């Protein structure tokens, strides 16, 4: 409620220029239930979008904690985090999956993953929660299930035009699924994903996605007997190198050595 | 009638009304809300959405494809400009005369297709003074600065860029404003290099590198690779020339023809 106050005063806006005066003071002073309808109305007058209001929640709290401890690469703190969330099924499964990256003994069980994938498969419309769960747990989902879920995600996710985060994420996960489809020679799956990815990249900058897609689509061309695909992959590696993206550069260069 | 949407999202995740009920909202109060028979506080709605692991910004994106008055204004101008349709842009400016900052922006954009209409420096002064008054730069302020930059003198533009860079808000789940600030910072860096304000250039280079730290944003990184290379060259670093050529190759490899041609024409001109 008082988040409204600071944002209002932050733009040097008065109550009198924004209902009545005393009415708006209430809520800012906590003397009334405001409906979200009237809240969006006030934020719109202040020229603040709701996407922006949220930026300035259980799942976000967890992510912030994971991010902090994972940046420190501190296994002990992450195991403590795992304990604190052990009673939350999907969340703890995700923590184990993430923790596995820097502690190979930690892994979600087959049954934990199965409970997660059954949930994702049951959702009618994917949001940030489902997208992030799939992304962080992908290493422990077999490919056939991963493609199934990726297909559901792409064909039934929502995103804001004012905030295309979900769209960007779905694009990245679609490309990730694509490079595996090509690894396992599911070229019918690959064909499907290429058309979805091309569509998602339309009228967007997204140079990171285009760069990885240049590599993966080139990888696809090569296995389809098109030699020029090799050029595309080499070009993608140069982009990583030129931008000083060492992790991406050395990571994809290694995939190149293996598969090419 | 946000209730209909809450219901569809709830049923969509196979969640029961009972599991959402608690100390703050009963089952009856939730179902009455979903049916549009009653209304609940925003605090209580956010509580329900938190249980569904949906944030209110996601919730508003569904339910309705409508947008804020400002974002809708931008949408019209955006493709009116693409149409080169001077008719409606002149008409759009009419309904916003009572909106000082909005009209000033429309004039600034309208200028870049028919220069007879430009914001008066009196209008620009009111805008810049407003931007200087704000304590936290949001989408509104960032976009206003962006679309009016051509009519702001460099020195004020540099001070406004400093203010923006050091007082904008962004979350880890929404990098939108941060990406925009990075772009406008680069655009100010371009002017700093051309006017040889190398003290200002050095400042902006440090900020941009920090803004790009631990982020994707390969577009901003590609442009900055070129612009920073242009800065390095003007001060006697031949490596800056290679950086610019590298940036050109990126545009080319990614099939970004327009950006490739445009920057290539700048590379041929200023060498």
């Amino acid at each position: 409620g008082k988040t409204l106050r600071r944002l209002r005063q932050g733009k040097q806006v008065s109550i009198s220029s924004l209902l009545s005066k005393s009415q708006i003071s209430r809520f800012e002073r906590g003397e009334s239930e405001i409906s979200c309808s009237r809240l969006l109305n006030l934020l719109d007058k202040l020229n603040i979008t709701i996407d922006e209001f949220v930026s300035t929640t259980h799942f976000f709290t967890l992510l912030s904690r994971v991010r902090k401890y994972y940046a420190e690469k501190n296994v002990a703190k992450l195991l403590k985090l795992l304990e604190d969330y052990a009673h939350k099924d999907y969340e703890s499964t995700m923590i184990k999956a993430i923790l596995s990256s820097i502690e190979p003994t930690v892994e979600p069980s087959e049954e934990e993953v199965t409970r997660l994938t059954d949930y994702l498969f049951s959702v009618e419309q994917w949001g940030y929660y489902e997208i992030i769960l799939l992304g962080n747990c992908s290493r422990f989902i077999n490919y056939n299930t991963l493609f199934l879920l990726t297909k559901e995600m792409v064909t039934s996710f929502a995103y804001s035009e004012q905030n295309k985060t979900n769209k960007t994420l779905v694009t990245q996960l679609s490309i990730n699924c694509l490079i595996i489809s090509i690894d396992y020679s599911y070229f019918d799956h690959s064909h499907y994903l290429i058309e979805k990815i091309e569509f998602l990249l339309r009228d967007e900058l997204n140079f990171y996605e285009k760069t990885v897609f240049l590599y993966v689509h080139g990888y696809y061309k090569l296995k389809q007997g098109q030699v020029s695909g090799k050029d595309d992959m080499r070009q993608a590696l140069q982009i990583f190198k030129y931008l000083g993206e060492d992790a991406l550069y050395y990571s994809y260069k290694e995939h190149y050595r293996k598969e090419v």
Side-chain angles (χ1 to χ4, degrees), chain A residues 179 182-183 214-224 226-234 237 252-260:
Chain A
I179 194 169
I182 300 161
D183 288 326
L214 179 65
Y215 184 96
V216 177
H217 188 49
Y219 181 29
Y220 170 83
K221 289 180 181 181
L222 187 63
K223 284 205 168 179
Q224 291 298 285
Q226 191 174 355
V227 188
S228 69
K230 192 186 296 179
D231 303 330
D232 295 338
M233 296 171 74
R234 290 188 294 94
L237 297 174
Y252 278 84
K253 185 200 296 175
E254 184 58 29
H255 177 271
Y256 185 90
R257 172 170 302 114
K258 200 211 193 313
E259 298 292 346
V260 182

Side-chain angles (χ1 to χ4, degrees), chain A residues 31 35 48 126 153 160 166 168 171 184 192 206 218 232 258:
Chain A
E31 311 170 66
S35 58
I48 309 172
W126 288 52
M153 177 179 60
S160 174
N166 289 358
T168 304
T171 305
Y184 292 178
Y192 177 89
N206 283 319
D232 295 338
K258 200 211 193 313

Side-chain angles (χ1 to χ4, degrees), chain A residues 171-182:
Chain A
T171 305
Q172 295 173 5
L173 293 182
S174 291
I175 296 166
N176 291 336
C177 188
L178 174 57
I179 194 169
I180 299 176
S181 78
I182 300 161

Side-chain angles (χ1 to χ4, degrees), chain A residues 31 50-51 64 96 110 131 135 146 161 167 180 193 220 223 229 251:
Chain A
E31 311 170 66
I50 186 66
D51 297 85
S64 176
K96 290 180 183 179
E110 187 174 25
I131 294 164
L146 183 66
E161 186 61 21
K167 181 173 177 181
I180 299 176
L193 293 174
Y220 170 83
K223 284 205 168 179
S251 294

Side-chain angles (χ1 to χ4, degrees), chain A residues 182-242:
Chain A
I182 300 161
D183 288 326
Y184 292 178
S185 296
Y186 286 84
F187 295 118
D188 60 339
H189 293 183
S190 303
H191 190 268
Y192 177 89
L193 293 174
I194 289 165
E195 178 162 14
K196 293 294 180 180
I197 292 163
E198 283 177 347
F199 171 84
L200 289 168
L201 294 170
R202 287 187 199 168
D203 302 325
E204 305 291 355
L205 293 171
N206 283 319
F207 274 28
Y208 166 72
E209 292 75 15
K210 287 175 179 169
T211 301
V212 179
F213 189 45
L214 179 65
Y215 184 96
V216 177
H217 188 49
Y219 181 29
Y220 170 83
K221 289 180 181 181
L222 187 63
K223 284 205 168 179
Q224 291 298 285
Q226 191 174 355
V227 188
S228 69
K230 192 186 296 179
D231 303 330
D232 295 338
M233 296 171 74
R234 290 188 294 94
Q235 285 169 0
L237 297 174
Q238 289 299 88
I239 294 171
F240 291 143
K241 177 179 169 185
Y242 294 168

Side-chain angles (χ1 to χ4, degrees), chain A residues 3-15:
Chain A
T3 303
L4 211 215
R5 189 208 275 288
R6 312 303 201 178
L7 286 171
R8 172 191 61 100
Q9 301 180 294
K11 297 186 194 242
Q12 304 301 322
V13 182
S14 62
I15 302 296

Side-chain angles (χ1 to χ4, degrees), chain A residues 114-130:
Chain A
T114 300
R115 282 198 301 273
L116 173 62
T117 58
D118 289 345
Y119 165 73
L120 296 172
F121 185 75
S122 73
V123 175
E124 110 292 17
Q125 173 176 311
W126 288 52
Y128 188 72
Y129 183 70
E130 291 78 23

Side-chain angles (χ1 to χ4, degrees), chain A residues 12-214:
Chain A
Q12 304 301 322
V13 182
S14 62
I15 302 296
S16 62
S17 53
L18 290 174
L19 322 167
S20 69
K21 293 158 182 230
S22 305
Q23 180 66 274
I24 301 175
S25 301
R26 300 182 215 127
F27 176 54
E28 257 190 27
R29 259 307 203 130
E31 311 170 66
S32 284
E33 277 190 15
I34 200 176
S35 58
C36 276
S37 184
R38 294 186 180 279
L39 174 55
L40 293 171
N41 178 34
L42 289 173
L43 295 173
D44 187 23
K45 291 172 66 59
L46 293 164
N47 302 288
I48 309 172
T49 179
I50 186 66
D51 297 85
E52 198 171 44
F53 182 84
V54 172
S55 297
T56 59
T57 158
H58 188 270
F59 190 56
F60 287 10
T61 294
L62 168 59
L63 291 182
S64 176
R65 288 169 177 168
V66 172
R67 181 171 175 274
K68 177 170 180 173
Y69 297 147
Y70 191 90
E72 299 175 15
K73 296 291 182 299
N74 194 302
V75 178
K77 277 150 166 275
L78 283 167
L79 284 167
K80 181 62 166 60
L81 186 66
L82 176 55
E83 285 185 356
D84 295 340
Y85 285 88
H87 64 285
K88 298 284 182 178
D89 192 34
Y90 308 143
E91 287 77 6
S92 61
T93 295
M94 187 190 70
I95 293 161
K96 290 180 183 179
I98 291 171
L99 184 47
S100 185
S101 304
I102 58 174
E103 182 55 70
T105 57
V106 179
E107 287 192 352
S109 66
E110 187 174 25
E111 184 51 36
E112 279 181 317
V113 176
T114 300
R115 282 198 301 273
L116 173 62
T117 58
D118 289 345
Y119 165 73
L120 296 172
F121 185 75
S122 73
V123 175
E124 110 292 17
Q125 173 176 311
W126 288 52
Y128 188 72
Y129 183 70
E130 291 78 23
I131 294 164
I132 294 295
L133 284 173
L134 179 65
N136 289 325
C137 299
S138 291
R139 295 202 323 182
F140 302 100
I141 302 169
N142 71 82
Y143 168 74
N144 300 108
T145 299
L146 183 66
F147 177 71
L148 180 84
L149 295 174
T150 298
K151 186 173 178 182
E152 297 297 317
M153 177 179 60
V154 172
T155 59
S156 70
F157 78 94
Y159 74 99
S160 174
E161 186 61 21
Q162 305 172 332
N163 178 22
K164 303 189 177 188
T165 298
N166 289 358
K167 181 173 177 181
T168 304
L169 293 174
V170 169
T171 305
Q172 295 173 5
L173 293 182
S174 291
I175 296 166
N176 291 336
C177 188
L178 174 57
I179 194 169
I180 299 176
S181 78
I182 300 161
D183 288 326
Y184 292 178
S185 296
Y186 286 84
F187 295 118
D188 60 339
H189 293 183
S190 303
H191 190 268
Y192 177 89
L193 293 174
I194 289 165
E195 178 162 14
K196 293 294 180 180
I197 292 163
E198 283 177 347
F199 171 84
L200 289 168
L201 294 170
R202 287 187 199 168
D203 302 325
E204 305 291 355
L205 293 171
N206 283 319
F207 274 28
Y208 166 72
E209 292 75 15
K210 287 175 179 169
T211 301
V212 179
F213 189 45
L214 179 65

